[PDB]
């Protein structure tokens, strides 16, 4: 029952300034502490700050103590996280993990989903969707595997799923590629050898820039 | 925000018993843990008891000078937390305090006042107030001293005052001395210079074992 | 500050096999040492905490040991899941120093990938572009030397691959390539390949079309 | 058992100097678990300093704590009125919970002679046959100071119960209290009661007297 | 038991001054079984004056004590370099013999700074791998100073161990002293090993330093 | 006159048993009593035993802290004392001094120097003495400092010389601090002025558990 | 200084009756009290110490008690050898004050004097002097009123009377009187008497003689 | 076994000095401490010093401190009370008592004799002895009574023994008596009835002046 949800997905310009929420549920929001961690692109886990829920006081990890505001909204159990003039390193997944007791010592129990602030003058650009059948080669034998490529969008978080609740299959989500300030992904799924294409499979695609193009594959 | 208010010292036989509660107001933690600490000069400030809750989980912890003597219990629903003390011994003497802190890395614990506990064979003797007041002799500086005597009282706990607290500057209690068994105090008041001394101006004597007082002068 | 230093960064080890992760400490900190466990996409969740204790949810299986200065981490036998990067963090003193990580690369067997070669959508050509792509699916080893031929000769410019780390649920892992040419250059050319060079064949695997009509 | 020790037990520091006490413990532990604590004259103690650099509250900017493991201090930086007092650190990582000595804070201040101030017992006390001389030596410093009675032109010492104070929080001076516990026949056989008192102020001890009007 | 407080158990007096300190017993008692005793830095106790007026011996006329049934107390004509000790009166009259608190002795002087010794870990105990910077901050006065260690310029406080002296004898001064215990690793993967103290004689942070010569 | 002479003192595992001796020169009374004395910042100086030869008696005493566990005993023909303490427990680690005084209403106690008596499961670890020089840092003053380290060693008396007492001038032995169950500590001294430091300047280092030394320098 | 101040200088008490001697203390004096006794002519010996403690060779009958400031003694049957000033002394503080002592007077019953006139010796009276004395011997109560007569009349100068202090085995008083003549003065008179006038008896014991040669 | 001897009486004129000896015998001399007493004519006893034997360390009461050297000579096991600037007070009996621990606390146990000083600058003049017989009265009937009396005399101490250990009858020895610095004495002995006087019953009289005279009594 108890989750931790946070913002979704956010795409500012260097300098600008972004407040990240991560909102407690299942328990009192004021009994446990709370950690602010990031994670570099590619590279590791490193501790921003720590907070006291009951008395709003902060400490910072000193790489992380200027042009950050870590506050919280007690009533409607939700911290937040300030960034102010935002650089080339901003851009990072960054989590809320709950401070717990254990043990006479303390541990982050709950940790919430996660956060991609991208910092970017690219302007958010729309994909398009289209649906790779193999027909005329007559991949026939043992089984299928049909794709799906997403080309050019900006920024990075994209949802890929195959008829939505298909996935138990071999799907393959390959992660996305940076050229020219735009965005390529593709995903394969591999169905009943000789059997489904009798039925519909669909890519189904969902962006945050309200389009949601959902392609089916004809062949 | 949180406030603690205990209440439940005072003298009983040694190998008798004793129970001290402490109430704690506006402290809405689920999780924290509270502790019982001690004072006396015998051995200065010493920690006996522990009790936490953890979500799920009341785990009590003690020590050498009370492993078998002292027990905690909390149930009020929730606010209330209980030392029981028996078998107390003549080292048992100090003033108890309740600590408390909800489980956070870094927090703030809350302190009560305490309560006196005293152990000794020894009844309870009241206090002897006597009023002090110069003549022509104490025409020293330029002010006016005169004061009052608190003659061989039993336990210690005590509150020597003037006119109620009206008159809280240039006030002087002294610490209690100890003389077979008994114990005794003054306090000192350095009323404005001219002669107003004397009338008006009232010496009052709190000693818990039902015995209060308010007395007069020249 | 006090610096967390984990022994080793990569570390293979494969499926019923015991594999003990070591890291130290500058600076004693007793036993508040956890370890936190992260697979990709996902969010980090808490293995050991104190050291020495098993978090709720988790196995049997995941231990640790520690002391003062020097900690370790031990999954008796790997499984194909256990696949991640496996971090330490210190929570004594002010700033929590978290160590780099260890990635688990599990060894495993020989296997060639399922080729798929596709031609560019119909919808694609008409707004202009032509991209073909490969899907070089389920091998292993890691590398593959992926090559296409147009017409003839290989094209090196246009490509750009992309692959997925260790598959958690057979530990294989799987790539994509796509060459993108824009619908001229595209009609000009009728035959294609995907050559996928790899170590499990002495003789690669190929898929290929040539502009037909479906 | 963890054994904390504060150095150093005992100091004397010029009013305004940055004064720095500290807390050596015997196994390492945890920045959080390390509180202390101020406790004025008689009164409760008050947590001063929890983590170990957090300040309580009411608590002023001039004071700060910082250290970690085994080593810990507590710093003021400028030392005033209503910071002489007693300063323990405390220990809540591991059981027993041990407290560490203590630390005693005297504020020097300009010498200042002493108000004495006699006082014969009184007739409600003679009531009993019981009298008891008293007598104050207030808001004096230095701590340094002799009070002898004498019982015409004699000094007596059986029965003399001395008390003295702190340093007060507004102007850090002393103040002692020196009774003469009697009886009405020991007593009213006497006349001239005195109370002298030799301090640094003066090469005169301070008299103050009276000459009984009894029964 | 019977109750001996000693009065006060903390003092620092003018070199010169009639110091005088008290002890109260809580019965009273025969003059002819109250002791006392000085304990100079670590030595045994010295039984100083027995009766309560007979100087032991080697003790100086400076040197006699007071007093009778419940309250006592002992004098130093005038102050001097060898007085600075710590004083317990004792109790030989009724079992059991309870002794009292102590006194601390603080003899004053002239402000001194401090002579800083920096010495880098011994070649014969880096065998080990094991390397603990010394340093000395001798000869000083008054007793309040906070030493810094600085590893390339980076201030460190773990693994520090203080030790200090108490008021010499001939000169009244103090010395501290303050190792850096490491390790050869995090030792030999750094460079610049300072010692720097704040003193009260010279808002310029005395430094010593040395950057290392290893394998 | 009198010389008292005490050995005896060391590490014993708790639980197990010390017996500690004192020998009376030139202490020709045939009535006094003889009194054994503790001390150690737990609890400061606190008296145990005291035995007493009145013409025709021997009564011996003890308090709370020994009652059952410590036993005294005098019997050379006519010279040493014999405190025989077993059974002992965490506590009592202190050192130990015999103290004496004829049977006179004025007299003066004679004292011991007294024997360390540590109890605990650690055993023995030997000091490792390590050599201290500078190099061209401390050329501070116009004097000579040099020192010398002492290492985690267990039971704590011991004795840090130079040039075994030769040079007794500007020496600075420092107390023995306590990292986890073991000991360190140096001594400095500060030899003439100009260059002779280093050589012929010995660090003799004395640890009773058969650890003797002798060190050099740069 | 400690004033040691006891209740009854003088005190009368009958064989085989009890009485108690009071003695105060100043200032507390705790059980640091001892009681010696002083028979005439002979030196004082210890009898209670520590203020309820018998000394050595005491009888059962010496009894003490005593605390802080105030102490007692008490034989509990009185005899006629028990004559005597009894002290008490303090040993606590530095001047050891003494108290004033306390003399027994055992009353008892009246007797009348044996009575002895003599006249003076052959050798004396060669050398110059002639000195009668009389002993009147074994009375009770202790005024008497000795008077002598010579040839008529009594004489009042030349007497010099002599007393000691109640016998101890019987409890009894004694005198001597003796009054000095110069042989000449002597010489002139022929009747002597000695007069015991006293108590006992309304009429007077009466020796006497006259210038005879034996 | 255990006795303390002191010096004989003494006479001085005042403003002379004296040294009164007090032995001891039958124990160990230093390991008891020693006070010295002083009890005026009629007078009452008063405390004077005390002494360590062992260090030679007194402490003298306050009217003591001045003109009175309270020494001693351990090899003989004896005290010494010296006496400077003789004056009409310094007459009294002064005496010398052990001090013994008994239960916690001290008493004199062990007293001396006494001793007596007596400061005048009257002469010292031997007396005379004059036998006392009843004849020419026959005070014959119940028992008979004899008589001594020494005349005229200085210093006060004289010994009046009766047939020397007579005594156990009636013996009255009445205290001398002073008038013109000179001194009187008598003695009285009751002896059987009618049976002894058939037997001679003499008067030994001696007195620190040499002389020694032992006058029977015929008749």
């Known amino acids: 029952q108890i989750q931790l949800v946070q913002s979704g997905p956010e795409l500012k310009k260097p300098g600008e300034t972004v407040k990240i929420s991560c909102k407690a549920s299942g328990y009192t929001f004021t009994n446990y502490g709370m950690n602010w961690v990031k994670q570099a692109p590619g590279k590791g886990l490193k501790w921003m700050a720590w907070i006291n829920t009951y008395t709003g006081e902060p400490t910072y990890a000193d790489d992380f103590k200027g042009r950050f505001a870590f506050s919280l909204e007690t009533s409607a159990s939700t911290a937040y996280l300030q960034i102010n003039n935002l650089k080339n390193e901003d851009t990072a997944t960054y989590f809320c993990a709950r401070d717990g007791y254990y043990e006479n010592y303390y541990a982050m129990d709950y940790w919430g989903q996660g956060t991609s602030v991208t910092v970017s003058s690219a302007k958010t650009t729309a994909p398009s969707v289209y649906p790779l059948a193999p027909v005329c080669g007559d991949t026939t034998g043992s089984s299928v595997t049909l794709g799906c490529l997403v080309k050019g969008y900006f920024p990075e978080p994209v949802t890929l799923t195959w008829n939505s609740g298909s996935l138990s299959s071999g799907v393959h989500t390959f992660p996305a590629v940076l050229q020219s300030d735009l965005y390529t992904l593709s995903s394969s799924v591999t169905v009943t050898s000789s059997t489904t294409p009798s039925q519909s499979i669909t890519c189904n695609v969902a962006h945050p820039a309200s389009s949601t193009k959902v392609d089916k594959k004809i062949d | 925000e949180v406030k603690l208010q205990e209440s439940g010292g005072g003298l009983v036989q040694p190998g008798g018993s004793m129970k001290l509660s402490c109430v704690a107001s506006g402290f809405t933690f689920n999780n924290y843990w509270m502790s019982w600490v001690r004072q006396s000069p015998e051995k200065g400030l010493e920690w006996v008891a522990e009790?936490?809750?953890?979500?799920?989980?009341?785990?009590?912890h003690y020590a050498e000078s009370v492993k078998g003597k002292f027990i905690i219990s909390r149930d009020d629903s929730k606010s209330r937390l209980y030392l029981q003390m028996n078998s107390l011994r003549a080292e048992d003497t100090g003033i108890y305090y309740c600590v408390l802190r909800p489980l956070f890395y870094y927090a703030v614990d809350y302190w009560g006042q305490g309560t006196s506990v005293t152990v000794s064979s020894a009844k309870t003797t009241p206090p002897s107030v006597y009023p002090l007041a110069p003549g022509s002799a104490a025409q020293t500086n330029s002010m006016v001293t005169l004061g009052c005597l608190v003659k061989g009282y039993f336990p210690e706990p005590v509150t020597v005052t003037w006119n109620s607290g009206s008159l809280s500057s240039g006030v002087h209690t002294f610490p209690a001395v100890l003389q077979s068994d008994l114990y005794t105090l003054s306090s000192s008041v350095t009323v404005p210079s001219t002669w107003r001394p004397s009338e008006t101006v009232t010496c009052n004597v709190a000693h818990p074992a039902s015995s209060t007082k308010v007395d007069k002068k020249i | 500050?006090?610096?967390?230093?984990?022994?080793?960064?990569?570390?293979?080890?494969?499926?019923?096999?015991?594999?003990?992760?070591?890291?130290?400490?500058?600076?004693?900190?007793?036993?508040?040492?956890?370890?936190?466990?992260?697979?990709?996409?996902?969010?980090?969740?808490?293995?050991?905490?104190?050291?020495?204790?098993?978090?709720?949810?988790?196995?049997?299986?995941?231990?640790?040991?520690?002391?003062?200065?020097?900690?370790?981490?031990?999954?008796?036998?790997?499984?194909?899941?256990?696949?991640?990067?496996?971090?330490?963090?210190?929570?004594?003193?002010?700033?929590?120093?978290?160590?780099?990580?260890?990635?688990?690369?599990?060894?495993?067997?020989?296997?060639?990938?399922?080729?798929?070669?596709?031609?560019?959508?119909?919808?694609?050509?008409?707004?202009?572009?032509?991209?073909?792509?490969?899907?070089?699916?389920?091998?292993?080893?890691?590398?593959?030397?992926?090559?296409?031929?147009?017409?003839?000769?290989?094209?090196?410019?246009?490509?750009?691959?992309?692959?997925?780390?260790?598959?958690?649920?057979?530990?294989?892992?799987?790539?994509?390539?796509?060459?993108?040419?824009?619908?001229?250059?595209?009609?000009?050319?009728?035959?294609?390949?995907?050559?996928?060079?790899?170590?499990?064949?002495?003789?690669?695997?190929?898929?290929?079309?040539?502009?037909?009509?479906? | 058992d963890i054994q904390l020790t504060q150095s150093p037990a005992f100091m004397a520091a010029s009013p305004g100097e940055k004064v720095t006490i500290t807390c050596s413990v015997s196994?390492?532990?945890?920045?959080?678990?390390l509180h202390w604590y101020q406790q004025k004259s008689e009164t409760s103690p008050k947590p001063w300093i929890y983590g170990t650099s957090n300040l309580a509250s009411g608590v002023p900017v001039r004071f700060s704590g910082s250290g970690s493991g085994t080593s810990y201090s507590l710093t003021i930086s400028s030392m005033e009125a209503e910071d002489a007092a007693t300063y323990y650190c405390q220990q809540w990582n591991s059981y027993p919970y041990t407290f560490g000595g203590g630390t005693k804070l005297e504020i020097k201040r300009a010498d200042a002679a002493p108000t004495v101030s006699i006082f014969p017992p009184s007739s409600e006390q003679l009531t009993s046959g019981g009298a008891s001389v008293v007598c104050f030596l207030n808001n004096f410093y230095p701590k340094d100071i002799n009070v002898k009675w004498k019982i015409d032109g004699s000094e007596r010492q059986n029965g003399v119960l001395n008390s003295w104070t702190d340093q007060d929080s507004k102007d850090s001076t002393y103040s002692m209290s020196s009774t003469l516990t009697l009886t009405k026949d020991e007593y009213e056989r006497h006349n001239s009661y005195t109370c002298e008192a030799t301090h640094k102020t003066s090469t005169s001890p301070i008299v103050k007297s009276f000459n009984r009007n009894e029964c | 038991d019977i109750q001996l407080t000693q009065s006060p158990a903390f003092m620092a007096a003018s070199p010169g001054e009639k110091v005088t300190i008290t002890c109260?017993?809580?019965?009273?008692?025969?003059?002819?079984?109250?002791?006392?005793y000085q304990q100079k830095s670590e030595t045994s106790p010295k039984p100083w004056i027995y009766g309560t007026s007979n100087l032991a011996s080697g003790v100086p006329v400076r040197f006699s004590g007071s007093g009778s049934g419940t309250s006592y107390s002992l004098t130093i004509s005038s102050m001097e370099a060898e007085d600075a000790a710590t004083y317990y009166c004792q109790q030989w009259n009724s079992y059991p013999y309870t002794f009292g608190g102590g006194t601390k002795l603080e003899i004053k002087r002239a402000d001194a700074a401090p002579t800083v010794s920096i010495f880098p870990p011994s070649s014969e105990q880096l065998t080990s791998g094991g390397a603990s910077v010394v340093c000395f901050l001798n000869n000083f006065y008054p007793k309040d100073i906070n030493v810094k260690w600085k590893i390339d310029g980076s201030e460190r406080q773990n693994g520090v161990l203080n030790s200090w002296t108490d008021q010499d004898s001939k000169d009244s001064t103090y010395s501290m002293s303050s190792t850096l215990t490491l390790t050869k690793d995090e030792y030999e993967r750094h460079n610049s090993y300072t010692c720097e103290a704040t003193h009260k004689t010279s808002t310029s942070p005395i430094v010593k330093s040395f950057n290392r010569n290893e394998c | 006159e009198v010389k008292l002479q005490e050995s005896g003192g060391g590490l014993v595992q708790p639980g197990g048993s010390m017996k500690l001796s004192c020998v009376a020169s030139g202490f020709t009374f045939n009535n006094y009593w003889m009194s054994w004395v503790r001390q150690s910042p737990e609890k400061g100086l606190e008296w145990?035993?005291?035995?007493?030869?009145?013409?025709?008696?021997?009564?011996?005493?003890?308090?709370e802290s020994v009652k059952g566990k410590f036993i005294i005993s005098r019997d050379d023909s006519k010279s040493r004392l014999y405190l025989q303490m077993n059974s002992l427990r965490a506590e009592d680690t202190g050192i130990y001094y015999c103290v004496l005084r004829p049977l006179f209403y004025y007299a003066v106690d004679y004292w011991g120097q007294g024997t360390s008596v540590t109890v605990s499961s650690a055993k023995t670890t030997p000091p490792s003495v390590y050599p201290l020089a500078p190099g061209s840092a401390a050329q501070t003053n116009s004097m000579v400092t040099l020192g010398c380290l002492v290492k985690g060693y267990f039971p704590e008396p011991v004795t840090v010389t130079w040039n075994s007492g030769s040079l007794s001038s500007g020496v600075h032995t420092f107390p023995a601090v306590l990292q986890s169950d073991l000991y360190t500590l140096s001594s400095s001294v500060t030899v003439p002025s100009t260059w002779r430091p280093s050589e012929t300047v010995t660090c003799n280092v004395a640890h009773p558990a058969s650890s003797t030394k002798v060190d050099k320098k740069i | 200084?400690?004033?040691?101040?006891?209740?009854?200088?003088?005190?009368?008490?009958?064989?085989?009756?009890?009485?108690?001697?009071?003695?105060?203390?100043?200032?507390?004096?705790?059980?640091?009290?001892?009681?010696?006794?002083?028979?005439?002519?002979?030196?004082?010996?210890?009898?209670?110490?520590?203020?309820?403690?018998?000394?050595?060779?005491?009888?059962?009958?010496?009894?003490?008690?005593?605390?802080?400031?105030?102490?007692?003694?008490?034989?509990?049957?009185?005899?006629?050898?028990?004559?005597?000033?009894?002290?008490?002394?303090?040993?606590?503080?530095?001047?050891?004050?003494?108290?004033?002592?306390?003399?027994?007077?055992?009353?008892?019953?009246?007797?009348?004097?044996?009575?002895?006139?003599?006249?003076?010796?052959?050798?004396?009276?060669?050398?110059?002097?002639?000195?009668?004395?009389?002993?009147?011997?074994?009375?009770?109560?202790?005024?008497?009123?000795?008077?002598?007569?010579?040839?008529?009349?009594?004489?009042?100068?030349?007497?010099?009377?002599?007393?000691?202090?109640?016998?101890?085995?019987?409890?009894?008083?004694?005198?001597?009187?003796?009054?000095?003549?110069?042989?000449?003065?002597?010489?002139?008179?022929?009747?002597?008497?000695?007069?015991?006038?006293?108590?006992?008896?309304?009429?007077?014991?009466?020796?006497?003689?006259?210038?005879?040669?034996? | 076994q255990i006795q303390l001897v002191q010096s004989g009486p003494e006479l001085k004129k005042p403003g002379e000095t004296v040294k009164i000896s007090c032995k001891a015998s039958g124990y160990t001399f230093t390991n008891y401490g020693m006070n010295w007493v002083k009890q005026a004519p009629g007078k009452g006893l008063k405390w004077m010093a005390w002494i360590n034997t062992y260090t030679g360390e007194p402490t003298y009461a306050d009217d003591f401190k001045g003109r009175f050297a309270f020494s001693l000579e351990t090899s003989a096991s004896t005290a010494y009370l010296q006496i400077n600037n003789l004056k009409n007070e310094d007459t009294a009996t002064y005496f010398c008592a052990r001090d013994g621990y008994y239960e916690n606390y001290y008493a004199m146990d062990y007293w001396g004799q006494g001793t007596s000083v007596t400061v005048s600058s009257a002469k010292t003049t031997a007396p005379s002895v004059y036998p006392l017989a009843p004849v020419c009265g026959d005070t014959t009937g119940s028992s008979v009574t004899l008589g001594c009396l020494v005349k005229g005399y200085f210093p006060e101490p004289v010994t009046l023994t009766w047939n020397s250990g007579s005594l156990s009858s009636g013996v009255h020895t009445f205290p001398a008596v002073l008038q013109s610095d000179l001194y009187t004495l008598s003695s009285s002995v009751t002896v059987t009835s009618s049976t002894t006087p058939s037997q001679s019953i003499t008067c030994n009289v001696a007195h620190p002046a040499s002389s020694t005279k032992v006058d029977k009594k015929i008749d």
């Open positions: 196994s390492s532990i945890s920045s959080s678990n």
């Open positions: 009790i936490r809750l953890n979500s799920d989980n009341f785990a009590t």
